[PDB]
Design an enzyme around this catalytic site. Structure first.
Site, PDB file in Angstrom:
ATOM      1  CB  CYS C  16      -0.964   0.019   1.189  1.00  0.00           C
ATOM      2  SG  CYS C  16      -0.291  -0.448   2.798  1.00  0.00           S
ATOM      3  CG  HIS C 282      -3.424  -0.404   5.715  1.00  0.00           C
ATOM      4  ND1 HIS C 282      -3.985   0.252   4.640  1.00  0.00           N
ATOM      5  CD2 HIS C 282      -3.403  -1.717   5.386  1.00  0.00           C
ATOM      6  CE1 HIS C 282      -4.310  -0.628   3.711  1.00  0.00           C
ATOM      7  NE2 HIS C 282      -3.969  -1.830   4.140  1.00  0.00           N
TER       8      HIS C 282
END
Ligand SMILES: [Zn+2]
Lengths: 514, 75, 337
Positions: C16, C282
């Site tokens: 990500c 994240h």
């Protein structure tokens, strides 16, 4: 904090300034000039145009720049302010240091003096201003007389200038906060905040009754203040760059200014636009001291970043132009010659020798271990001389060098002082046996060779010169105690050494064990 | 020579270094001053991130050169 | 069910960090057009940087095609609309072997590696062309010229250094709420150097107090702001700062510029990190649609790209999450107006 040992490699007598001059004081009764040297030495000169050698004496106690000096008590007493964080009290007639005040915690930058009260004040980069009664300072012991201080608060940034009036009723500080702060020195009460400057203020003057103030600032302006009105009553823009130095006549009507642009002007306060170029000096002007033999001052002494000190004559001031090209004067009336500063230093691979370059482009070779010069090499190429003396050997770093005074100052730190073991044979020593010597440990023993507590004298392989200054300081500048190597046997010195020598030096010099 | 380092708070600190010093030496000097592990440091000079094993002269870092200290926000 | 015409990016194993900045690069004004030009020059003349340009054009076309595939007949797709960028990940692995495996990485670090390599391509192709606008790609979009002024307060000599920069490394807190104005001022405004950390003036040959200021001189099309959302105590020893700055929509660097300008920049992309620690987290991205094809129902709204997923959030509703929480901002992208 962490205590360092240092020493200076120099001659017993440094007749000439080895760096620029920060401040000036004129004794009119004895025709003597005091210079506060960036080379850490204060010197007394005769200003008789008779004498061929104007040098009189050096006053050697500071370890760093001497930033300000004040002659007190009809020339009997000098007080000095230094970048070594101390204020020192001198006998100005005999030229020796009597006491050392250590209340500052950073570079002391400015001193102020109230003649009618024998009051002096000190101020520096630590934002502190301490007040000192001069008659109070001569303290032989703690029972007959402990010196006591009084200080002012409010400064939000480092203080660069300071003035008191003759009556001792007003004190003003100038700083990088761009406001002038005013107190009553008698009560330590804050009086007012004078706003107007847009840069540092390095020059301050007060009239006799402390009702007007002149400030000189790095913004290029001079400002006149009314203290009764707490406001600026005139702004003068006579310089192109920062104004660093101000003088004023007895009548408080003509101001003499100097600074970074090397030009020195006399401007009439009653008619600002009319200003006169007195001269253009050869280096930025740091301080000026009027000769006050006669009302219209006959001459002005000028201190700059150069080691020479020039007296400029003022005979011939009786103009029209606001931006004069031609200086009123072209050659100084008197010149006190200065010497060269060491401006570049390279430690050789043997961690023992140093190559220097000075302001004359002269190159010299020094022996750090024996604390002395080895040979002058003249005007050889500095880097070619470095590459020419390269030897493929590794020795751990064990000292540091500094050029702040223009002379070689060597500093030893516990972290790496003992890092360099060498063999007696490769170091040129002989007793015979060839064991392993620790350079920092031998040097420390030579520095304290005259200290009786280290006896059972020296290290048995070499001595330093007896006149070598030995300095015990705190990391990043602050001197604790300074003596000459030969003086350690004194009763005062042995007591002060016992109080100041850190245990990591004691281990080697007293207990004789690595 | 003296170089500048902009810390995580935006405050500038000075470091005494030499051109032959490796980047590991600089990170260890920052650890002495800022208590940050070297393997956790990231140093930017003029937009280029410095790499261990190279020296300061490899990046043409001189006096008054500014290094910017950051960390690795792994995600 | 309610699928969107904008393309996502599959997670290939803790990627990500790559997907976030890639989604921001796609929406930068001159980036897409620029890499096509660099692809068209490599396609004529002539591995390493060339492969990276091809991989970038491979993905951009793959994203543009998948969007056109959806706009033609959207009933082909159900609950997913994303492409994998494996060729770009493989070239990055060849450029820097730290990107091998499937570990977590810093989004700023991978942006630096991409932009820095594209610039190496531009400068390598400048030499091969001149020996016999396109190569100005990174320099006009993301890179700016900085001016670092150091003034010794003793002698008042002011020295200068010009350093290039692509993002502005900015602090988040001091060690209640700090605005971005404060934060850029910590970076650029005057900083007095005093005390046990004094500047060494080679002219004075002495440690002195100094005033340090940084000024923006040449400014690009996109201003990247890289927040230092972390701090250290010395106690692993490091920690993230979850509270963010007060983030404005319009930005002007006039007060920190070298010359007075009237250039104002508008926030259009934000890369965020979610997690309590620095060691892992994240990354997601959020991009605002501005300026051309019939899709104007969305102009003014904020698309949120969460790897293969993508949402539409409201201007006011996203702006609240950006300032004091869930994810915390790490990069901010503004663009000239
Ligand atoms: Zn200076």
């Amino acid at each position: 904090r962490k205590v360092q040992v240092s020493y200076v490699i120099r001659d017993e007598v440094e007749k000439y300034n080895r760096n620029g001059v920060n401040a000036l004081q004129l004794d009119p009764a004895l025709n003597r000039l005091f210079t506060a040297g960036r080379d850490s030495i204060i010197r007394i000169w005769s200003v008789n145009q008779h004498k061929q050698d104007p040098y009189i004496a050096s006053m050697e106690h500071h370890t760093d720049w001497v930033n300000d000096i004040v002659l007190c008590c009809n020339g009997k007493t000098l007080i000095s302010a230094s970048s070594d964080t101390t204020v020192k009290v001198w006998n100005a007639h005999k030229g020796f240091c009597m006491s050392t005040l250590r209340t500052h915690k950073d570079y002391v930058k400015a001193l102020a003096y109230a003649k009618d009260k024998e009051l002096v004040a000190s101020a520096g980069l630590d934002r502190q201003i301490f007040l000192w009664d001069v008659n109070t300072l001569t303290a032989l012991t703690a029972s007959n007389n402990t010196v006591t201080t009084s200080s002012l608060s409010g400064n939000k940034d480092s203080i660069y200038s300071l003035a008191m009036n003759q009556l001792g009723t007003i004190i003003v500080s100038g700083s990088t906060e761009k406001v002038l702060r005013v107190w009553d020195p008698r009560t330590c009460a804050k009086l007012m905040k004078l706003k107007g400057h847009t840069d540092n203020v390095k020059a301050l003057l007060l009239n006799r009754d402390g009702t007007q103030c002149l400030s000189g600032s790095s913004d290029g302006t001079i400002r006149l203040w009314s203290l009764g009105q707490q406001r600026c009553i005139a702004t003068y823009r006579v310089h192109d760059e920062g104004v660093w130095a101000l003088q004023v006549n007895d009548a408080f009507t003509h101001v003499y200014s100097g600074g970074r642009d090397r030009k020195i002007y006399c401007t009439d306060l009653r008619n600002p636009d009319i200003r006169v170029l007195i001269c253009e000096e050869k280096a930025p002007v740091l301080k000026m001291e009027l000769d006050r033999s006669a009302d219209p001052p006959p001459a002005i002494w000028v201190a700059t970043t150069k080691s020479t000190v020039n007296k400029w004559t003022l005979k011939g001031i009786h103009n029209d132009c606001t931006n004069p090209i031609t200086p009123l004067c072209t050659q100084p009336d008197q010149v006190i010659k200065g010497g060269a500063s060491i401006i570049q230093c390279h430690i050789l691979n043997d961690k023992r020798h140093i190559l220097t370059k000075d302001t004359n482009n002269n190159v010299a070779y020094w022996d750090v271990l024996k604390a002395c010069k080895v040979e002058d090499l003249g005007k050889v190429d500095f880097e070619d001389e470095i590459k020419k003396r390269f030897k493929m050997v590794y020795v751990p770093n064990w000292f540091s060098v500094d050029l702040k005074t223009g002379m070689l100052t060597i500093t030893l730190d516990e972290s790496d002082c003992f890092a360099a073991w060498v063999s007696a044979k490769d170091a040129g020593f002989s007793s015979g046996s060839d064991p392993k010597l620790n350079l920092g440990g031998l040097l420390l023993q030579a520095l304290l060779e005259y200290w009786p507590r280290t006896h059972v004298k020296g290290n048995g392989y070499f001595q330093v010169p007896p006149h070598t200054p030995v300095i015990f300081g705190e990391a990043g500048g602050r001197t604790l105690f300074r003596l000459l190597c030969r003086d350690s046997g004194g009763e005062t010195e042995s007591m002060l050494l016992n109080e100041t020598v850190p245990q990591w030096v004691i281990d080697i010099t007293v207990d004789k064990n690595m | 020579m003296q170089i500048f380092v902009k810390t995580l708070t935006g405050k500038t600190i000075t470091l005494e270094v030499e051109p032959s010093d490796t980047i590991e030496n600089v990170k260890a000097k920052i650890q002495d001053k800022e208590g940050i592990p070297p393997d956790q440091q990231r140093l930017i000079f003029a937009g280029k991130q410095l790499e261990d094993g190279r020296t300061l002269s490899d990046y043409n870092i001189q006096k008054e050169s500014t290094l910017h200290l950051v960390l690795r926000l792994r995600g | 069910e309610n699928l969107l015409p904008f393309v996502g990016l599959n997670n290939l194993g803790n990627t990500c960090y790559l997907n976030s900045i890639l989604q921001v690069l796609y929406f930068c004004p001159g980036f897409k057009s620029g890499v096509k030009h660099l692809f068209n020059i490599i396609s004529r003349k002539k591995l390493a940087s060339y492969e990276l340009i091809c991989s970038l054009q491979s993905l951009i076309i793959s994203v543009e095609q998948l969007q056109a595939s959806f706009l033609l007949n959207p009933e082909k797709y159900t609950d997913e609309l994303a492409t994998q960028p494996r060729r770009l990940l493989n070239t990055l692995r060849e450029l820097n072997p730290m990107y091998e495996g499937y570990l977590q990485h810093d989004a700023q670090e991978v942006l630096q590696c991409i932009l820095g390599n594209i610039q190496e391509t531009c400068q390598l192709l400048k030499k091969e062309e001149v020996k016999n606008i396109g190569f100005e790609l990174v320099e006009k979009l993301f890179q700016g010229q900085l001016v670092l002024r150091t003034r010794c307060l003793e002698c008042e000599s002011l020295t200068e250094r010009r350093e290039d920069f692509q993002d502005i490394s900015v602090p988040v807190q001091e060690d209640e709420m700090k605005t971005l104005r404060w934060a850029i001022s910590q970076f650029a405004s005057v900083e007095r150097i005093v005390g046990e950390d004094k500047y060494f003036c080679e002219n004075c040959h002495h440690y002195t107090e100094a005033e340090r200021s940084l000024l923006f001189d040449k400014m690009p099309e996109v201003i990247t702001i890289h927040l230092k959302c972390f701090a250290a105590s010395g106690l692993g020893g490091l920690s993230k700062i979850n509270t963010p700055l007060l983030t404005p929509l319009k930005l002007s660097l006039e007060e920190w510029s070298t010359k007075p300008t009237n250039d104002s920049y508008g926030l259009f992309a934000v890369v965020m990190h979610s997690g309590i620690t620095i060691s892992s987290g994240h990354y997601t991205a959020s991009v605002k649609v501005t300026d051309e094809q019939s899709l104007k129902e969305y102009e003014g709204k904020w698309l949120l790209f969460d790897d293969s997923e993508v949402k539409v959030t409201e201007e006011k509703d996203f702006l609240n999450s950006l300032s004091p929480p869930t994810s915390t901002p790490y990069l901010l992208f503004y663009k000239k107006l």
